[model samples]
Target: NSNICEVCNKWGRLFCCDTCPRSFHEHCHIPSVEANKNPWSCIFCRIKTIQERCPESQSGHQESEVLMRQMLPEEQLKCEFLLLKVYCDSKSCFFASEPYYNREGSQGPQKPMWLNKVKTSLNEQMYTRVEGFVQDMRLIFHNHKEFYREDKFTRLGIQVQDIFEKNFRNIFAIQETS
Candidate 1:
């Protein structure tokens, strides 16, 4: 017990992140004990929380929901393979990220844009079918209001529905490309 971690109060020849000074055992501080001398971000500095949580910030967000779907090929090209992001962008109203719900893990989404990139990749299908699908999805999100979760589906128009159905059929069905 030569080094003592100041943050977690671990005893031994341990240390803390040079930047943050939050202490941890050399082994515990990093994922790999063998790889010890690298720039590692501490929990304090590395962490990103809801902006609203800070009282001085004067803005706080509520619990929010996110919905996602993989788009077909054609839709990808039409939408430029951009992610179908849906969130409260306004500072006046927004929601914080959920700790448990992540696309991959802590490595997942640091912000809403991370989710957008994921959807963007999925949208880059080889066909145009996804184009209409993305369009409709965007439309639904564009005018979002109360409980933007599943409520947007109700505003979908007949044209949007038809395009959506058409896109789906084209995605899964074999057709003559000539």
Candidate 2:
């Protein structure tokens, strides 16, 4: 309980509170807490980052965090950062991708999901779990395969998904520890 999050037992670079045994994720803190360079002082220090950083920006490798919520500030930042990181890298490099499957006789398996739609979902906090978020990125990639002939467009999915998981692993700290 001391060395881990009071809400989550896993580790990130946990916020330290010498006053208590409870360590917290940078996003989670004691609701009514006291001093620490760790920043338990200002009520919205963390909240401000999540706020002042308004209108910012998700992943998966099967998150073990068990219960996930974007309600927290840093968590939202992660999802948003990941989203921007992906789209930023993607667009600048992967211009070879687009939408042309807007036709019939092209009976795909499921409904269409695109970049903006997923971004909309993140804005609404529809995804409660981190895993819930990343899989959507996968869904975008997956949807790419269903409609396309997998020659040129499909390649973009590979590039995008590559960074998606890459950032996700490092961003979410999902990499296996030695």
Candidate 3:
């Protein structure tokens, strides 16, 4: 299971995104971990002292979000922030508890050059019913408890099912609630 990344060559963990399947180290993704009694940040974001301002260099976590936004553009981009919030906090998440979660130890796709092209391609694809459902899911998550509270979970569950029927012609049920 311990294999060197053909791309990064880091002697660390390699985990893939569940949605996109891109491989990265846990710390490279920027999740928090506990070292001794101290909350240790990834090497990229671990500051010895408070700088009074955000670091001039953007953190790996921020860049990951940027990359995801570029990759998905419209529907997928909408889920990026909330997805990160959930993922970064999950112990079982790819980046969670990993030392390389947010560290920039590898040279891979940077912001502009390739990401823009990828985003453009995604935007050009036919906006299918599945894509629309993805958008609705994003809208649900974006609003969160403000709109879709757990108390109204049953109602929203039926509502989303309705949306599924409209979009997919009842061809398939939205099996994945989460």
Candidate 4:
């Protein structure tokens, strides 16, 4: 680790990634630097793994195309409305851009998710099943929690997630399947 925050490029206490050359201040990293978990790898270096499984993510993720199904017309509309609800209610521009926090796709989140991507994907029809839409929406908040376990940003993610959860329950009565 250098004497500077790689993202902000300022000097201060820095947490170095165990698996990569990057180091960051607690606030500079997307999934901010961790203080616990000995020899922690930075978010940049950490990717959810499912081994050779067939598109199933065991690491609390399920966005793989093979794991998805088809959606009805009304279901598509409900998913669209859900996305708008969370976006409008969030009140933070954070959902607008993909949370790379720094660098490009290869160095950032393996599945870079943002709110608008969910919006367009639902419209352009990438998600075939309701579960697909739900997980992707959850992934937005998942990234936040993964990035900022405890902070204003973390709380924002929770708030929006709550909004999604409530509306999701209302819309689909909370789909019975994962």
Prediction 4 TM-score vs. true: 0.53
Question: By summed lDDT, which 10 consecutive residues of candidate 4 come out lowest?
Answer: 48-57
Best by TM-score: 2
Query: Candidate 2's residue-wise lDDT over 61-164, tens digit each?
Result: 33566226443656765776666556545342332233445645455546556666666777787887766777777787777766665467667777777877
Estimate the TM-score of every prediction.
Answer: 0.25, 0.54, 0.19, 0.53
lDDT per residue, candidate 4, 50-136, as tens digits?
122323322332234323546865456556555655644534367667666652332334577887677667657787787788888
Worst 10 residues of 3 by lDDT: 92-101
Candidate 1 steric clashes: 13
Please give the RMSD to the true structure for each candidate, in Å.
19.4, 13.5, 19.0, 17.7
Off-target runs (Cα >4 Å) in candidate 4 are 1-69, 90-92, 102-108, 175-178
**lDDT for each residue of candidate 3 in 18-127, tens digit (9 for 90 to 100):** 33334446433423123243333322232212222444322322222332333333333222222232332222121222121122433321221221122233345433
Q: Per-residue lDDT tens digits of candidate 1, residues 1-178?
A: 2255532345766655655555556433322123455776443343222122443322321211001323433223223312211211222112212223322222322222222333333434333344444443444323332223344433433333344334333332323242
Which stretches of candidate 3 lie above 4 Å from their native place? 1-51, 54-83, 89-178
Find the candidate with the highest lDDT and give its number.
4
Q: Output the lDDT of residue 128, model 4.
A: 74
Ranking by lDDT: 4, 2, 1, 3
